[PDB]
Design a protein around this motif. Structure first.
Motif, PDB file in Angstrom:
ATOM      1  N   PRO D 318      91.253  50.770  59.198  1.00 17.51           N
ATOM      2  CA  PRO D 318      90.011  50.000  59.138  1.00 17.51           C
ATOM      3  C   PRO D 318      89.541  49.631  60.531  1.00 17.51           C
ATOM      4  CG  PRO D 318      91.549  49.174  57.529  1.00 17.51           C
ATOM      5  CD  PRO D 318      92.295  50.187  58.341  1.00 17.51           C
ATOM      6  N   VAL D 337      82.008  53.380  61.190  1.00 15.10           N
ATOM      7  CA  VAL D 337      82.674  52.214  60.619  1.00 15.10           C
ATOM      8  C   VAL D 337      83.582  52.687  59.498  1.00 15.10           C
ATOM      9  CG1 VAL D 337      82.399  49.960  59.558  1.00 15.10           C
ATOM     10  CG2 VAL D 337      80.697  50.788  61.166  1.00 15.10           C
ATOM     11  N   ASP D 339      86.572  51.583  56.647  1.00 16.33           N
ATOM     12  CA  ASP D 339      87.144  50.471  55.900  1.00 16.33           C
ATOM     13  C   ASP D 339      88.510  50.810  55.320  1.00 16.33           C
ATOM     14  OD1 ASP D 339      86.012  52.301  54.105  1.00 16.33           O
ATOM     15  OD2 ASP D 339      85.790  50.763  52.556  1.00 16.33           O
ATOM     16  N   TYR D 345      82.405  54.378  56.152  1.00 23.29           N
ATOM     17  CA  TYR D 345      81.554  53.381  55.519  1.00 23.29           C
ATOM     18  C   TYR D 345      80.128  53.457  56.041  1.00 23.29           C
ATOM     19  CZ  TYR D 345      80.707  49.086  52.971  1.00 23.29           C
ATOM     20  OH  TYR D 345      80.261  48.154  52.070  1.00 23.29           O
TER      21      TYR D 345
ATOM     22  N   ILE E  79      76.361  45.375  53.412  1.00 24.63           N
ATOM     23  CA  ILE E  79      77.645  44.963  52.858  1.00 24.63           C
ATOM     24  C   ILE E  79      77.382  44.058  51.662  1.00 24.63           C
ATOM     25  CG2 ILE E  79      79.849  43.875  53.319  1.00 24.63           C
ATOM     26  CD1 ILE E  79      79.625  44.585  56.168  1.00 24.63           C
ATOM     27  N   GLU E  87      74.116  42.943  58.212  1.00 23.93           N
ATOM     28  CA  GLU E  87      74.899  42.573  59.388  1.00 23.93           C
ATOM     29  C   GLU E  87      74.368  43.380  60.572  1.00 23.93           C
ATOM     30  OE1 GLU E  87      79.126  42.487  59.028  1.00 23.93           O
ATOM     31  OE2 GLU E  87      79.427  43.736  60.810  1.00 23.93           O
TER      32      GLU E  87
ATOM     33  N   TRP G 109      82.818  37.119  58.511  1.00 27.81           N
ATOM     34  CA  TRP G 109      83.266  38.117  59.478  1.00 27.81           C
ATOM     35  C   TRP G 109      84.601  38.726  59.085  1.00 27.81           C
ATOM     36  CZ3 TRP G 109      79.425  39.681  62.112  1.00 27.81           C
ATOM     37  CH2 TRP G 109      78.438  38.806  62.556  1.00 27.81           C
ATOM     38  N   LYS G 110      84.828  38.910  57.790  1.00 28.81           N
ATOM     39  CA  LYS G 110      86.077  39.459  57.284  1.00 28.81           C
ATOM     40  C   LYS G 110      85.930  40.960  57.090  1.00 28.81           C
ATOM     41  CE  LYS G 110      89.250  39.119  53.338  1.00 28.81           C
ATOM     42  NZ  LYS G 110      89.000  40.455  52.737  1.00 28.81           N
ATOM     43  N   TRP G 111      86.869  41.721  57.649  1.00 29.82           N
ATOM     44  CA  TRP G 111      86.855  43.162  57.542  1.00 29.82           C
ATOM     45  C   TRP G 111      88.299  43.643  57.539  1.00 29.82           C
ATOM     46  CZ3 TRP G 111      83.173  46.273  56.084  1.00 29.82           C
ATOM     47  CH2 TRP G 111      83.338  47.643  56.247  1.00 29.82           C
ATOM     48  N   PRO G 112      88.706  44.480  56.575  1.00 29.43           N
ATOM     49  CA  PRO G 112      87.920  45.126  55.522  1.00 29.43           C
ATOM     50  C   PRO G 112      87.498  44.154  54.441  1.00 29.43           C
ATOM     51  CG  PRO G 112      90.213  45.516  55.102  1.00 29.43           C
ATOM     52  CD  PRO G 112      90.145  44.737  56.393  1.00 29.43           C
ATOM     53  N   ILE G 113      86.540  44.541  53.609  1.00 31.38           N
ATOM     54  CA  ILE G 113      86.065  43.692  52.532  1.00 31.38           C
ATOM     55  C   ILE G 113      87.237  43.175  51.707  1.00 31.38           C
ATOM     56  CG2 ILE G 113      83.880  44.901  52.466  1.00 31.38           C
ATOM     57  CD1 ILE G 113      84.874  46.381  50.011  1.00 31.38           C
TER      58      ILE G 113
END
Ligand SMILES: CCCCCCCCCCCCCCCCCC(=O)OC[C@H](COP(=O)([O-])OCC(O)COP(=O)([O-])OC[C@@H](COC(=O)CCCCCCCCCCCCCCCCC)OC(=O)CCCCCCCCCCCCCCCCC)OC(=O)CCCCCCCCCCCCCCCCC
Ligand SMILES: CCCCCCCCCCCCCCCCCC(=O)OC[C@H](COP(=O)(O)OCCN)OC(=O)CCCCCCCCCCCCCCCCC
Ligand code: SF4
Ligand code: SF4
Ligand code: SF4
Ligand code: SF4
Ligand code: FES
Ligand SMILES: [K+]
Ligand SMILES: [Zn+2]
Lengths: 125, 176, 108, 388, 210, 264, 113, 115, 96, 48, 96
Positions: D318, D337, D339, D345, E79, E87, G109-113
């Motif tokens: 990720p 990007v 994930d 993504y 997202i 974003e 700002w959290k990644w991955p979902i």
């Protein structure tokens, strides 16, 4: 500075989806089941959203699987149930939520396989 | 490390100036321009004669997909759907059922030569070198339907060209 | 072979649709087609001008230029090697060579 | 505004750069404003890539800038390598560089010639295009496809160079420099060419930075900046070449810069052939580099890793990143990007021609109508990547 | 640097500098900057409250130690799993110091972000695209409109909830002598392959339980 | 409650009932210990040794699936001493295994293609010959190709502990050992069709579904069965508008993860 | 002695860099007075201007000065200064030094979902 | 809390203003549109269609949304005014070629599956 | 190459080059189309001892980003990196 | 064949006047080349 | 074996044929239903069985890298012939 709007959020009229697909489609919210053929549970984490199915007829020329619905191949991933519900509410699709089914963990014990008076003991290995 | 391209200072001496003045009133540099063109008139054109001649190619060339057979004659493909799962354009359609003798084999196998991008991935992913791309490219058709190759068309092409496909693969299977 | 390089679109003889056909660009293509004096032969070149090629499933891509105009010769390959395209043009000339306008007229 | 005209390239002429619908606002003879419309080729590449595997997505980057192919693939490859946290083998880095310069030769030949084709200079179009034909074979003899090779992939390249190729690239390079000198013998000193591209489209140094220019646009007005020198990627730190710098800022210098870059490509190829090292061509990490057919058909693990890398692809850690290279036209990069899944993504593509076109309005102020021909050409705009 | 051809050699020196340059911006504009993080492949990330688009971008463009003259890139990442679904992301270049920084914000459909065109003329069109493809609105933009999609495109494509095949496919009709539109019908449906492996790939990125 | 005892998992304390297996403890923090011979609905055997994990400050890696946890333990599930164990174990299971993935049914939904990619090494150093076993015909439902069997003893424990039948077993010794009935007997039972699932390899695949479609091109669609009143939750795997198969869906209250043969 | 060109298009030559710089850095220090002395921007901007100005005095010749400043061409330092100055005035209107305007949502700002 | 940043209109009373401003913009433009593109529908038809698209949005209540709906309208109008659109783009609102799609229940049950 | 001696000189004079030395068309100096079969080198990880994958792990060595300042939870001015250096004029041929 | 011309023009085929029932005295097309000679004709291999 | 239907249409090795009433066969009017006559199932049956000594024999389709993956075929059972999954060639142990 900042106004105070006190209305239910809704953007059904700006996304551009024809109404035929807004009030008619019945979105589905669920934690994807575990593919029983494997024991990996990495894909039973994020709440997926999807619509109902619609007919797939056969192209006469080649017998392919033609379709008319453009949202058949549409899938979205949401981190929790609520995040998914809101996205359906603010678009108009009548949703149906299904509760996560967490496997009830079991009390495995190797030493039970060899019992003095319990039927759990195995006749082979 | 850089360098300057257009930073020349014309020396103001009379002789040098007379040259830049000579250049304008006599078009000399333009007369030179007519020189290079004249030379190319007396050179030998790089034009080949088609179709009596062909443009050089290489064993790795990519062309019209085709399906191969073992030396015995049996189909090499075993309907493993690797080629379908990798064809970027999803131009491949496949179906399979256990043949009469209980051997995994295809029933429907279609390549859409209009959705194909001629990427060569299909021949990379085949674990038995069944689906390949022959050295043929002159297969323009007068109708769209003709460019939808199903199992029968692909097998015929494989048989049609197999005398050459193996020859190319022979010389090149080592690099892969 | 006599196939000149540049000609006024309103004094053409054949159109070679080369490349993708976006929904935005589609109306312009049809407009140009109607301005072509007869006879007008349309040749589809490549794989995105035939069935959407790599971009068959793109919302803004016309799945095959044949939807916008009637194509005469289809040239596969993305891109069709410069030699293959030449085969199509030669093939087109034969396709013309198999035309019998007046004979059909005499038998009306 | 006096009489706005929708100058259209839809009836495309022999320039093969795309289709451009241009809306202008003239004042008599002189142009006063511009408004390019660029939706005419937007295919949605940046959206489809969200459904493909990183491997399946690679061919798209080949069809963004369809005159600088292998450079584009290298840009994408570096981004995946960077996120994968693996390095291609040293031999691979030379091959990729070896063709980056060759591609840069391909790009400039199209740029300079067609830029001269538009202004009526028609002979130089052919001479150099013949060399493009010879160079196509090198593309074709390594990858089997004349243009959209897809030769460069995350982890190095696909197949090693065939025998007799480097010994044949050398043949091309040796005599090539004579080709350019013929080109200059009809463009540089010719007075007609000078009248068209001197004091035309002058870009101020500060503005070039602000509008977001890169490549020969930045270096065409003095700015000393070339990512092959400041942020090298593969081996460019291990070669010698002088980044040409112009001073006037007009079109003429950019034409000089491009012609000078091609010569600086030969000075590099001469070093790639002599320094080419031995070893394998792809990362010896089977989980990212599918094994050669020899091991696949013999070993168990060697097969599984050829059964997942062609149906599911390789997972990527990720994260997200922006990687850029000095593509022939200008800075080129992707904001990939990931994930954690085998499919990207998001992938924003920073086409160098996107900014160089928005700035056309600025450059076109106070110039005749015919000068937009010599202004658009000098920017080397290909609408494959403008729209994507 | 290490003797392992199959791994990426770390460049720790550049990583240390970013961390040092980290607080430099976190201390200077604490009214907006929410979170600053540095990725292991030497890329600095600055998280800013959306209001601070101009104060922060304008700062770095001109400060005597940032000098980020040129805007590399400007896009947005849809997202749908967050309240602020979109974003924004700004990629900045600095010729003088030879470094790149990434600045990110957060917004949604109905909360416009101030146009950054004043800070950089580069974002004149990149902001049209974001609106065109995602739907985010930019305040005070000199001329905001569709740049990519076809005229009258009743939808915002790059949103994650926009079907790949669109809603209308064109065709030419002889009855009316003009191109037309109709609901999309596909000769072959887009097959939707399911690729996710059910086994945890990277333990490092594991999301803790709920 | 005071029943629990603190156990660390990479230092992250979590409380678990005494008698909880090492694997179960690591599951709470979301770590799914790799496994081949374990199934929580089948008694423990512990023979694949793919689940071996490291215990902090101890010279021996303990089998995750069977080992009970004691108070104040720490379970390093990512150390090098643990990757070495797995890479080694996965080095053997892929030694005698054949190159059947392109024609094996499980190819695409196999616990050996996945756990090999994630955990096992990426190349093989086997320079010898291979084993080959002869097939069995134990019914018109469960196609059997035992050359791919990897001796998990799932099919064994399942039959003896779920279906109640005692026909499946292992015969022989050492590497010569085989899994079967030893006589031409059709293992038939209304639940008999559920060995097609537990078998993690292509050693027991559905015969009707054989050579029909790869797992990665089907669109699952949760539904319910109506063949009988129990109403088992099921996933109707389809493709191009064609029901290609039916698979159990987990639901503890109704049917755990079993579906009668008729429903399948 | 004076340069003929600056090496850039649209950046002319400063006749007396020494005198021009002393104006600006001195001018800048004036603007920084209003900004609160505890503000981070003032603390760092102050330092980076004292050092810049101090070296202006030392070198009498333009060429040797540049290689110590490390700002590129001498003119570029001047144009850099102007933008630096123009920023200072704006910063007073924005007042960045104030506490955080608003925290982000729980998992923005959290990644991955 | 509902503290939300507005775009243009701070309340419906101001927001509804631009709607009426906008309606006049179309209402006075339909005559130009018909002649400019040489469409084959009377000036009357266009305004009647115009009301429909305005009418279907009567149910809206959010001040921001109406600002957004308005913002799109100007772009749609600006393209029409400048002749950026094309004869095709103008008629896409009327759906000529589309045959009558059945809408009552018994009609649906005779033709197909779509509810 | 077939060009006569008289023509060879002419096109050199008109262009002022040794055109014959550097001709535009390939005659025989190219590699022959057929070459002996290759034998490719193998990778550096082809070994049968002390080569566990866990040591040469390409991806698992990666880790999430590091966080410098987070809102949830006398210093010298620092530049983002050392300032660029001044490029040296190319001494092979500084001026075109 | 004639190896004294530059690459490309050193291998050419003269087409029969008749084939498979078609009077190919004029209508000669590149697809009439049998597969075996294709590899040699297109300079993919050296040995005829 | 190309066995034609009473309606007069050929039958492929997959057995598909447009039966009497179906209109879809109209396309062939003026053209032909191209079929390949080298039926795969027939040709393999022509190839003969091979006698081997040990219980296990390795098949690769001949050519190594140019054939299907390597597979080891048990032959303990004598009431039937072992068959290679990929190529289908048969093997059998001799005099036992
Ligand atoms: C005007 C009056 C002056 C005539 C000047 C032309 C001349 O005679 O020069 C020929 C002669 C051939 O030119 P080249 O470029 O050196 O030959 C290249 C190879 O030798 C090329 O050699 P090759 O073996 O490849 O030649 C093959 C060629 C065989 O033909 C030839 O090789 C020579 C034919 C040249 C005829 C002139 O086969 C053909 O294709 C025959 C085509 C005949 C073309 C039509 C000729 C008649 C047209 C003029 C009629 C009205 C006058 O020119 C000279 O070498 C110098 C002579 C002075 C020319 C100036
Ligand atoms: C036409 C035939 C092809 C001519 C080939 C080129 C040539 O021989 O002349 C080139 C010569 C070089 O000129 P240049 O490169 O500018 O260097 C001198 C600077 N004063 O330039 C010249 O000196 C040519 C001068 C020709 C005479 C001027 C034109 C007079 C026209 C009326 C007669
Ligand atoms: S060449 Fe590529 S796109 Fe074409 S059929 Fe093969 S895999 Fe598909
Ligand atoms: S990859 Fe080869 S063997 Fe597998 S289905 Fe495709 S053609 Fe058949
Ligand atoms: S069980 Fe099947 S898919 Fe899995 S490794 Fe064995 S042959 Fe391959
Ligand atoms: S038959 Fe299947 S479940 Fe039974 S031991 Fe073999 S691989 Fe395991
Ligand atoms: S799961 Fe523990 S040894 Fe098999
Ligand atoms: K199984
Ligand atoms: Zn075989």
């Amino acid at each position: 500075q900042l106004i105070t709007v006190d209305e239910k959020l809704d953007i059904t009229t700006i996304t551009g989806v024809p109404e035929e697909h807004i009030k008619t489609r019945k979105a589905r919210i669920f934690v994807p089941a575990r593919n029983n053929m494997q024991s990996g549970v990495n894909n039973t984490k994020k709440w997926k959203m999807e619509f109902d199915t619609r007919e797939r007829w056969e192209n006469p020329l080649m017998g392919w699987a033609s379709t008319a619905d453009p949202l058949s191949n549409l899938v979205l991933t949401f981190s929790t149930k609520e995040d998914a519900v809101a996205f359906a509410e603010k678009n108009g699709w009548s949703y149906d939520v299904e509760e996560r089914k967490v496997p009830k963990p079991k009390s495995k014990s190797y030493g039970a396989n060899f019992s003095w008076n319990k039927r759990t003991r195995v006749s082979t290995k | 490390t850089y360098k300057y391209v257009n930073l020349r200072e014309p020396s103001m001496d009379m002789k040098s100036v007379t040259d830049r003045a000579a250049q304008t009133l006599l078009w000399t540099e333009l007369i030179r321009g007519l020189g290079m063109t004249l030379s190319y008139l007396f050179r030998e054109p790089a034009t080949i004669n088609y179709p009596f001649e062909k443009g050089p190619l290489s064993p790795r060339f990519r062309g019209e997909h085709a399906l191969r057979r073992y030396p015995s004659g049996e189909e090499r493909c075993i309907a493993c759907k690797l080629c379908e799962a990798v064809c970027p354009a999803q131009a491949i359609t496949i179906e399979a059922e256990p043949r009469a003798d209980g051997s995994r084999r295809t029933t429907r196998y279609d390549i859409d030569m209009t959705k194909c991008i001629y990427c060569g991935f299909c021949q990379e992913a085949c674990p038995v070198d069944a689906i390949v791309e022959g050295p043929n490219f002159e297969f323009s058709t007068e109708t769209h339907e003709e460019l939808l190759y199903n199992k029968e068309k692909l097998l015929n092409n494989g048989d049609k060209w197999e005398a050459e496909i193996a020859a190319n693969i022979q010389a090149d299977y080592l690099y892969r | 072979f006599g196939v000149v390089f540049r000609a006024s679109p309103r004094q053409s003889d054949v159109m070679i649709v080369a490349g993708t056909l976006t929904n935005k660009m589609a109306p312009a293509l049809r407009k140009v087609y109607d301005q072509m004096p007869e006879p007008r032969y349309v040749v589809s070149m490549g794989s995105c001008a035939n069935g959407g090629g790599y971009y068959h499933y793109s919302y803004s891509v016309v799945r095959g230029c044949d939807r916008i105009v009637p194509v005469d010769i289809y040239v596969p390959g993305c891109p069709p090697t410069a030699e293959a395209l030449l085969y199509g043009i030669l093939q087109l000339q034969k396709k013309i060579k198999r035309e019998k306008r007046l004979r059909i007229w005499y038998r009306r | 505004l006096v009489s706005n005209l929708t100058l259209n390239f839809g009836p495309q002429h022999p320039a093969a750069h795309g289709v451009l619908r241009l809306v202008m606002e003239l004042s008599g003879e002189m142009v006063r404003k511009c408004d390019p419309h660029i939706g005419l080729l937007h295919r949605g590449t940046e959206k489809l890539i969200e459904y493909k595997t990183y491997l399946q997505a690679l061919p798209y980057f080949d069809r963004l800038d369809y005159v600088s192919m292998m450079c584009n693939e290298q840009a994408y490859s570096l981004a995946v390598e960077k996120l994968l946290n693996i390095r291609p083998p040293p031999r691979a880095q030379w091959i990729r560089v070896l063709f980056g310069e060759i591609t840069r030769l391909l790009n400039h030949i199209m740029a300079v010639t067609t830029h001269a084709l538009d202004i009526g200079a028609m002979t130089p179009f052919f001479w150099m295009f013949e060399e493009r034909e010879k160079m196509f074979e090198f593309y074709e003899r390594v990858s089997g496809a004349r243009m959209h090779a897809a030769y460069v992939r995350p982890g190095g390249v696909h197949q090693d160079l065939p025998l007799g190729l480097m010994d044949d690239i050398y043949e091309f390079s040796k005599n090539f420099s004579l080709r350019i000198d013929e080109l200059e013998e009809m463009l540089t000193n010719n007075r007609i060419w000078r009248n068209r591209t001197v004091d035309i489209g002058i870009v101020t140094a500060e503005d070039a930075l602000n509008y977001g220019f890169s490549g020969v646009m930045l270096r065409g007005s003095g700015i000393q900046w070339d990512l092959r020198k400041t942020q090298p990627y593969d081996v460019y730190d291990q070669v010698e070449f002088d980044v040409p710098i112009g001073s006037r800022g007009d079109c003429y210098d950019r034409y000089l810069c491009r012609v000078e870059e091609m010569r600086q490509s030969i000075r590099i190829i001469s070093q790639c052939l002599n320094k080419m090292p031995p070893g394998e061509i792809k990362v010896d990490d089977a989980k990212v580099s599918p094994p050669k057919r020899a091991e696949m058909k013999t070993s168990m693990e060697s097969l599984i890793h050829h059964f997942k890398l062609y149906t599911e692809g390789y997972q990527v850690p990720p994260g997200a990143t922006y990687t850029a290279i000095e593509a022939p036209k200008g800075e080129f990069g992707v904001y990939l990007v990931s994930d954690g899944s085998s499919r990207p993504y998001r992938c924003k593509i920073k086409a160098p021609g996107f900014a160089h076109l928005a700035g056309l309005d600025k450059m076109s102020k106070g110039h005749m109508l015919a000068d937009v021909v010599a202004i658009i050409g000098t920017q080397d705009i290909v609408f494959g990547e403008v729209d994507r | 640097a290490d003797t392992r051809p199959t791994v990426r050699p770390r460049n720790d020196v550049a990583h240390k500098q970013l961390s040092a340059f980290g607080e430099y911006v976190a201390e200077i504009l604490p009214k907006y900057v929410q979170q600053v993080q540095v990725s292991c492949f030497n890329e600095l990330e600055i998280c800013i409250h959306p209001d601070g688009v101009i104060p922060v971008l304008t700062f770095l463009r001109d400060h005597s130690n940032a000098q980020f003259k040129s805007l590399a890139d400007l896009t947005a990442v849809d997202i749908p799993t967050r309240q602020n679904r979109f974003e924004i992301v700004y990629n900045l270049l600095s010729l003088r110091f030879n470094s790149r920084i990434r600045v990110k914000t957060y917004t949604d459909e109905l909360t416009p972000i101030e146009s950054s065109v004043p800070v950089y003329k580069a974002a004149n069109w990149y902001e049209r695209e974001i609106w065109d493809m995602f739907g985010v609105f930019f305040a005070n933009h000199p001329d905001l409109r569709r740049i990519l999609t076809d005229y009258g495109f009743e939808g915002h494509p790059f949103r994650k909830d926009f079907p790949l095949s669109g809603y209308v496919e064109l065709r030419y009709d002889d009855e009316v002598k003009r191109v037309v539109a109709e609901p999309v019908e596909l000769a072959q449906e887009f097959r939707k392959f399911d690729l996710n492996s059910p086994w945890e790939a990277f333990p490092a990125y594991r999301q803790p339980p709920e | 409650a005071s029943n629990l005892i603190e156990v660390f998992v990479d230092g992250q304390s979590v409380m678990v009932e005494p008698g909880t297996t090492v694997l179960q403890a690591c599951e709470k923090v979301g770590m799914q210990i790799p496994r081949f011979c374990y199934h929580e609905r089948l008694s423990v055997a512990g023979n694949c040794r793919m689940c071996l994990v490291e215990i902090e400050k101890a010279p021996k890696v303990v089998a995750a699936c069977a080992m009970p946890v004691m108070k104040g333990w720490n379970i390093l599930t990512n150390s090098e001493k643990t990757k070495k164990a797995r890479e080694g174990v996965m080095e053997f299971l892929l030694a005698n295994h054949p190159l059947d993935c392109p024609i094996c049914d499980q190819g695409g939904e196999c616990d050996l293609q996945d756990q090999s990619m994630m955990f096992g090494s990426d190349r093989s150093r086997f320079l010898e010959g291979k084993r080959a076993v002869e097939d069995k015909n134990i019914g018109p439902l469960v196609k059997t190709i035992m050359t791919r069997c990897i001796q998990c003893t799932r099919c064994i424990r399942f039959a003896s502990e779920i279906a109640g039948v005692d026909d499946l077993g292992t015969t022989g010794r050492g590497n010569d050992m085989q899994v079967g009935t030893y006589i031409e007997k059709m293992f038939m039972s209304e639940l008999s069709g559920n060995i097609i699932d537990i078998c993690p390899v292509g050693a027991l695949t559905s015969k009707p579904y054989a050579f029909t479609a790869r797992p990665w091109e089907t669109r699952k669609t949760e539904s319910i069965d109506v063949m009988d009143a129990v109403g088992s939750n099921i996933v109707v795997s389809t493709r191009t508008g064609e029901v290609m198969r039916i698979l159990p869906r987990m639901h503890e209250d109704i049917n755990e993860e079993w579906i009668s043969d008729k429903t399948r | 002695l004076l340069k003929k060109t600056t090496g850039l298009v649209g950046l002319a030559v400063c006749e007396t860099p020494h005198e021009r710089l002393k104006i600006l850095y001195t001018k800048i220090l004036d603007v920084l007075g209003h900004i609160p002395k505890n503000a981070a921007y003032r603390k760092y901007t102050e330092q980076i201007t004292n050092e810049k100005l101090s070296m202006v005095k030392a070198e009498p010749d333009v060429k040797k000065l540049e290689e110590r400043l490390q700002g590129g061409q001498i003119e570029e330092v001047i144009l850099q200064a102007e933008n630096e100055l123009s920023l200072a005035r704006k910063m007073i209107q924005w007042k960045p030094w104030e506490p955080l305007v608003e925290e982000p949502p729980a998992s923005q700002w959290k990644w991955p979902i | 809390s509902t503290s939300v940043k507005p775009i243009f209109s701070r309340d419906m009373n101001e927001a509804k203003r631009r709607v009426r401003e906008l309606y006049r913009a179309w209402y006075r433009e339909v005559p130009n549109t018909v002649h400019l593109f040489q469409l084959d529908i009377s000036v009357k038809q266009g305004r009647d269609k115009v009301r429909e698209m305005f009418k279907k949005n009567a149910h809206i209540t959010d001040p921001r949304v109406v600002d957004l709906l308005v913002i799109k309208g100007k772009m749609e109008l600006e393209e029409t005014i400048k002749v950026w659109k094309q004869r095709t783009h103008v008629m896409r609102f009327f759906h000529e070629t589309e045959a009558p799609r059945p809408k009552d229940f018994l009609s649906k049950f005779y033709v197909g599956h779509d509810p | 190459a077939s060009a006569t001696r008289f023509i060879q000189w002419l096109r050199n004079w008109a262009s002022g080059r040794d055109l014959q030395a550097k001709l535009q068309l390939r005659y025989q100096e190219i590699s022959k189309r057929t070459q002996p079969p290759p034998k490719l080198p193998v990778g550096p990880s082809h070994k049968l001892s002390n080569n566990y994958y866990c040591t040469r792990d390409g991806r698992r060595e990666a880790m999430p980003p590091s966080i410098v300042m987070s809102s949830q939870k006398e210093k010298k001015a620092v530049s983002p990196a050392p300032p660029i250096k001044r490029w040296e004029l190319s001494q092979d041929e500084p001026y075109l | 064949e004639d190896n004294k011309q530059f690459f490309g023009r050193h291998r050419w085929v003269i087409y029969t006047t008749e084939m498979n029932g078609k009077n190919t005295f004029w209508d000669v097309d590149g697809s009439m080349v049998p597969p075996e000679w294709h590899r040699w004709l297109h300079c993919m291999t050296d040995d005829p | 074996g190309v066995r034609t239907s009473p309606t007069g249409e050929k039958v492929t090795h997959t057995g598909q044929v447009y039966d009497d009433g179906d209109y879809r066969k109209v396309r062939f009017v003026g053209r032909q239903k191209e079929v390949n006559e080298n039926f795969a199932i027939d040709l393999i049956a022509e190839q003969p069985v091979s006698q081997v000594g040990s219980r296990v024999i390795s098949c690769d389709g001949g050519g190594g890298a140019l054939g299907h993956p390597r597979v080891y075929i048990n032959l303990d059972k004598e009431t039937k012939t072992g068959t290679c999954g990929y190529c289908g060639l048969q093997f059998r142990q001799q005099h036992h």
